[PDB]
């Protein structure tokens, strides 16, 4: 019941989304230049801080 990751780099995006890593909200300040072999998205992650969305 927990994500097994040994020897592979892992980024846990708590409160951050994958699309937020490009635009950079305050919730995604740590992962602006992130690097990993395994990326984990959470349900709590929000992509935008000002109301909006990503086309495609």
């Amino acid at each position: 019941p927990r994500i097994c990751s040994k020897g592979k780099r892992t980024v846990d995006l708590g409160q951050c989304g994958l699309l937020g890593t490009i635009t950079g909200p305050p919730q995604c300040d740590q992962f602006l230049e992130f690097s990993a072999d395994l990326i984990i998205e959470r349900r709590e992650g929000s992509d935008v801080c000002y109301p909006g969305k990503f086309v495609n």
Partner: protein, 56 residues
């Protein structure tokens, strides 16, 4: 398109992010008259990896 919308996060205005994948040598041009959110920095892919979604 200026118009009244529902209130999310205390702001009625909304924002759309659009993306392109530029080619190893291609020139992108941004001729705008306003309502433009310019990128500060580009984004470049690093390698390969996988992406998962979980809550554990």
């Amino acid at each position: 398109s200026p118009g009244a919308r529902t209130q999310v996060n205390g702001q009625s205005g909304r924002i759309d992010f659009h993306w392109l994948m530029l080619n190893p040598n291609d020139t992108v041009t941004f001729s705008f008259n306003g309502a433009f959110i310019a990128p500060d920095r580009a984004s470049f892919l690093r390698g390969k990896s996988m992406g998962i979604q979980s809550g554990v």
